[PDB]
Amino acid sequence: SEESQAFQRQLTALIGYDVTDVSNVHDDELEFTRRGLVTPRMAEVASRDPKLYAMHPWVTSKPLPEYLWKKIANNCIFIVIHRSTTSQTIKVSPDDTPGAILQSFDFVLRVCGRDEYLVGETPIKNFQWVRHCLKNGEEIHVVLDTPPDPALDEVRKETVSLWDCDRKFRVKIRGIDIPVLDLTVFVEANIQHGQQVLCQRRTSPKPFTEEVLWNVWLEFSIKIKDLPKGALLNLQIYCGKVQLLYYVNLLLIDHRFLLRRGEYVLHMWQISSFNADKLTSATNPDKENSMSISILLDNPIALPKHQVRAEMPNQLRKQLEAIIATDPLNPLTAEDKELLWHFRYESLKHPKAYPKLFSSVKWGQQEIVAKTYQLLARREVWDQSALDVGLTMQLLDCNFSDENVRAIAVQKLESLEDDDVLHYLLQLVQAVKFEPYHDSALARFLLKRGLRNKRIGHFLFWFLRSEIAQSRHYQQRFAVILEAYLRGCGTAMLHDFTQQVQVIEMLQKVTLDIKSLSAEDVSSQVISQLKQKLENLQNSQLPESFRVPYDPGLKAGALAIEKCKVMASKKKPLWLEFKCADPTALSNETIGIIFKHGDDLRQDMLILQILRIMESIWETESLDLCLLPYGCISTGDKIGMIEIVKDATTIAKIQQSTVGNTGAFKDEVLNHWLKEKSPTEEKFQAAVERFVYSCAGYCVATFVLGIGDRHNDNIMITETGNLFHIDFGHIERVPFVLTPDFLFVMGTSGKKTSPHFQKFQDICVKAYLALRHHTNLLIILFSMMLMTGMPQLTSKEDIEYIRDALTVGKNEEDAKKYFLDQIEVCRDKGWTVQFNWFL
């Protein structure tokens, strides 16, 4: 090809990884998966509606919450429509479709300021933009526009069976080789299914020289026929009690159902328990620095494909139901497992048993797996059950290495409306890390949902890009998936993405480079160089405009160079501000972005995403808690962008402005800072109200996530009362932050109970118990968040935190008093922890 000369090179610049490269493989799975994904791409590319894809209307089908109906004025909402200069307002009823607004005099209603549209056979109350304008209390400003051309979305034209082998499995350990290094070393070969170790053998310990040869056949007790698809040969290196130093993996049954054979020279990863990177089929690309193991597999041999009780004692049925009932983090004993397995079919009638049930399968037995597959072909009850994401997630996590088990989870995700895919996208993307193969139902599901929706597609991109840039363990796989998406998203977005990448690489350089200029307190000279470079950048590199990666509605244009700065901070982040590229954007507010190196923002992304989830949980119960989960995209290695939240300062700086440094903390400061930012009493008390919700939200949220105890230049408030935590990329005590200054805004002091503080407790306990009505879901998101986002060798102990936090097994009454105890610890401690942070 001759125009693939541009296209492929263009794809590599957009992906941030050369997909075609085969220097770091030992088989052809990645290349296979590229080819295997063409079909699911062609299928979505071809079946999606050209025009709806072009306008990507962002819509929901949940009920309009109680808090937003109470904001409707006599079943009528106002919409302002703009032509040239002149515009006029129109009365509308929540049920009005855009078409039923068009004939009210071919064009299309575009939102003012944004690349957001109000088109399609859904009521106007069902568009998120409208729901946003009610949320904050804004008028809906639209523009009579001609619909964008689908031609721009155009997509460029593109011999013996296994269950007959009764011989025991064995692998030759030839030896190991470190290029550069006084103890001893041995090799541990685990046959793994999920996190479960089926069989384990060791070499005898040898002296640890830069080369160690064993030449030994490690014979296993598991038969070849007893190997299940998705089994991992996990080779590990310990030294000497012992210590794990290098790990590496190899699928025993490969992507064409063939049993793995022959000579392998695999490069291994170092160490710096439950951790997604520990499961990777990827080899270490650093050939020169890293340790490698040499092995031999020999005996082709292929794995094939296949083609009742329900009357139990009382004591037994209950014991089963007690097991089904326990949380996702509860250990199943041998007794538990044997019980679930025997009552297989009774258990199948309970969708909630599924995780626990398929955790009872002895995957090291061919016949058992067969019975399991029999069982899965009988899933009417499952197939009929209403979607449960908490349940669906549990089956996609690290404890399930089975294509068919995982398929049934992805089956349920199929029914998510595009709104919920956005809510779970990040976590789903991360769950790809648990998939035993590069091609899987989960990867294809993300592929096609991404292709069907420019919004899911846009974030999909950034999420895969984020990992490709900083995970050697999973860049190859994500790269394959992203290339797949890119070859289907259509020229328009490829042009968008291209612009987006260029801009952020221009700016990352200006961050990299500026950071270097400062001895750790802003220099006078650094202002010269920054403002020079930002002018020197706008001259001949920055485009007329680019999409804001954390908000793809918003196009950013020229820089507000005058307003750009670098914080008095040790990580020297950039404070950039951009004019909106949209003339129709009847704002004047800039678009504010922070660029920061030094922090791992993948951790922020994860926590922020969880917060958006807690929000929608609250929505199901008609609660609003006015969390502020600001946009934040990680783009590379310890570097990314952060939404600047307009009119907001930190609690600490409010303490630093009235009292000064060495914080002799005063209580009245916040309340009269608020007062002094409020114009009227009306807008003041609304701001105090917003604070009661804001505070309680972040109280409940931070405690549950165990990130509650915080230094308070990490808590921010808007001039309109909105409290919100920031910089999550960090982590005697305190459950969450509820200081005398917050309490005084509520109207309390030391030991009292104002009208608002009662409401605070009321709102708290409601929020806390609402979360508990999704215990299972939060537990799994938290587990998954730890395993894929926080490198820490994260243990059971780390994860068991949220069990306690959400007081599992406890009744509603008992937990309400648990949470109220928490509040009272904060009441009791006052300024102690805050003061203690200082040093």
Binding residues: 592-601, 627-635, 724-731
Q: Quick count: other Cβ atoms within 10 Å of Cβ 812?
A: 11
Q: Where are the alpha helices (DSSP H) in 208-362?
A: 314-325, 334-342, 344-348, 354-357
Asked whether the beta carbons of 157 and 212 are under 8 A apart, the reply is no
Min separation Cβ 571 and ligand FJY, Å: 6
Min separation Cβ 830 and ligand FJY, Å: 23
**Which one of 5-13, 392-400, 453-461, 643-651 is the stretch in contact with ligand FJY (CB under 6 A)?**
643-651
Tokens, residue 590: 């800039």
767 vs 764: CA distance, rounded Å: 5
Min separation Cβ 599 and ligand FJY, Å: 7
- Nearer to ligand FJY by Cβ, of 622 and 650: the residue is 650
Tokens, residue 694: 């804001």
Q: Which residue numbers belong to the known binding site for ATP?
A: 592-601, 627-635, 724-731
**Which one of 117-125, 372-380, 473-481, 639-647 is the stretch in contact with ligand FJY (CB under 6 A)?**
639-647
Q: Which residues contact 823 (CB under 8 A, 6 or more apart)?
A: 699, 738, 761, 764
Q: Quick count: other Cβ atoms within 10 Å of Cβ 335?
A: 10
Binding mask 380-409 for ligand FJY (x = CB under 6 A): ------------------------------
- Nearer to ligand FJY by Cβ, of 152 and 567: the residue is 567
637 vs 466: CA distance, rounded Å: 8
**Which one of 274-282, 428-436, 477-485, 638-646 is the stretch in contact with ligand FJY (CB under 6 A)?**
638-646
**Which one of 18-26, 324-332, 420-428, 648-656 is the stretch in contact with ligand FJY (CB under 6 A)?**
648-656
Min separation Cβ 680 and ligand FJY, Å: 24
DSSP 8-state assignment for residue 397: S
Tally DSSP H helices, then E strands, for the chain: 32, 25
Min separation Cβ 515 and ligand FJY, Å: 12
Strands (E) across 4-158 are located at 77-82, 87-92, 108-111, 140-145
Min separation Cβ 592 and ligand FJY, Å: 7
- Nearer to ligand FJY by Cβ, of 629 and 735: the residue is 629
Q: What are phi and psi of 206, to 5 degrees?
A: -120, 160
Q: What are phi and psi of 351, to 5 degrees?
A: -50, -35
Asked whether the beta carbons of 534 and 510 are under 8 A apart, the reply is yes
Cα 604 to chain centroid distance, Å, stands at 9
Binding mask 652-691 for ligand FJY (x = CB under 6 A): -x--------------------------------------
**Which one of 448-456, 466-474, 573-581, 680-688 is the stretch in contact with ligand FJY (CB under 6 A)?**
573-581
Count of residues interacting with ligand FJY (CB under 6 A): 20
Q: Figure out which of the listed residues 433, 596, 690, 756 binds ligand FJY, where binding follows CB under 6 A.
A: 596
646 vs 822: CA distance, rounded Å: 32
DSSP 8-state assignment for residue 474: T
Q: Figure out which of the listed residues 87, 294, 650, 807 binds ligand FJY, where binding follows CB under 6 A.
A: 650
* Torsional sign, CA 428, 434, 438, 442: negative
- Nearer to ligand FJY by Cβ, of 374 and 569: the residue is 569
Q: Which residues contact 546 (CB under 8 A, 6 or more apart)?
A: 499, 500, 502, 503, 555, 556
- Nearer to ligand FJY by Cβ, of 421 and 566: the residue is 566
Min separation Cβ 565 and ligand FJY, Å: 5
Min separation Cβ 720 and ligand FJY, Å: 14
DSSP 8-state assignment for residue 259: B
Min separation Cβ 570 and ligand FJY, Å: 10
- Nearer to ligand FJY by Cβ, of 329 and 644: the residue is 644
Binding flag, residue 575, ligand FJY (CB under 6 A): yes
Min separation Cβ 656 and ligand FJY, Å: 9
**Which one of 509-517, 581-589, 642-650, 767-775 is the stretch in contact with ligand FJY (CB under 6 A)?**
642-650
460 vs 449: CA distance, rounded Å: 9
- Nearer to ligand FJY by Cβ, of 584 and 649: the residue is 649
Binding flag, residue 536, ligand FJY (CB under 6 A): no
Task: Tell me whether strands 243-251 and 262-267 are parallel, antiparallel or unpaired.
Answer: unpaired
Binding mask 18-57 for ligand FJY (x = CB under 6 A): ----------------------------------------
- Nearer to ligand FJY by Cβ, of 418 and 727: the residue is 727
Asked whether the beta carbons of 164 and 225 are under 8 A apart, the reply is yes
**Which one of 300-308, 500-508, 537-545, 640-648 is the stretch in contact with ligand FJY (CB under 6 A)?**
640-648
Min separation Cβ 254 and ligand FJY, Å: 45
Binding flag, residue 289, ligand FJY (CB under 6 A): no
Subset of residues 552 to 571 that bind ligand FJY, contact rule: CB under 6 A: 565-567, 569
Binding flag, residue 727, ligand FJY (CB under 6 A): yes
Q: Quick count: other Cβ atoms within 10 Å of Cβ 220?
A: 19
557 vs 536: CA distance, rounded Å: 16
44 vs 35: CA distance, rounded Å: 16
Min separation Cβ 690 and ligand FJY, Å: 16
Q: Figure out which of the listed residues 445, 463, 630, 742 binds ligand FJY, where binding follows CB under 6 A.
A: 630
Tokens, residue 256: 């064409």
Binding flag, residue 594, ligand FJY (CB under 6 A): yes
- Nearer to ligand FJY by Cβ, of 52 and 561: the residue is 561
687 vs 83: CA distance, rounded Å: 35
- Nearer to ligand FJY by Cβ, of 671 and 722: the residue is 722
Q: Figure out which of the listed residues 52, 645, 769, 790 binds ligand FJY, where binding follows CB under 6 A.
A: 645
- Nearer to ligand FJY by Cβ, of 259 and 723: the residue is 723
Specify whether the backbone of 92 is left (phi greater than 0), alpha (psi in -120 to 50) or beta. beta
Q: Which residues contact 26 (CB under 8 A, 6 or more apart)?
A: 250, 264, 265, 266, 283
704 vs 808: CA distance, rounded Å: 12
The residue count for the chain: 839
- Nearer to ligand FJY by Cβ, of 657 and 749: the residue is 657
- Nearer to ligand FJY by Cβ, of 359 and 511: the residue is 511
Min separation Cβ 561 and ligand FJY, Å: 14
Min separation Cβ 659 and ligand FJY, Å: 16
The DSSP code sequence of 22-64 is -TT-SSSHHHHHHHHTHHHHHHHHHHS-HHHHHH---B--SPP
Strand order in the sheet with 211-223: 211-223, 168-177, 292-297, 262-267
729 vs 598: CA distance, rounded Å: 10
487 vs 494: CA distance, rounded Å: 9
* Torsional sign, CA 508, 510, 511, 512: positive
Binding flag, residue 573, ligand FJY (CB under 6 A): yes
109 vs 482: CA distance, rounded Å: 32
Q: Which residues contact 253 (CB under 8 A, 6 or more apart)?
A: 162, 227, 228, 229, 230, 231, 259, 260, 303
Min separation Cβ 771 and ligand FJY, Å: 24
- Nearer to ligand FJY by Cβ, of 156 and 646: the residue is 646
Residues that bind ligand FJY (CB under 6 A): 565-567, 569, 573-575, 594, 596, 630, 642-645, 648-650, 653, 726-727
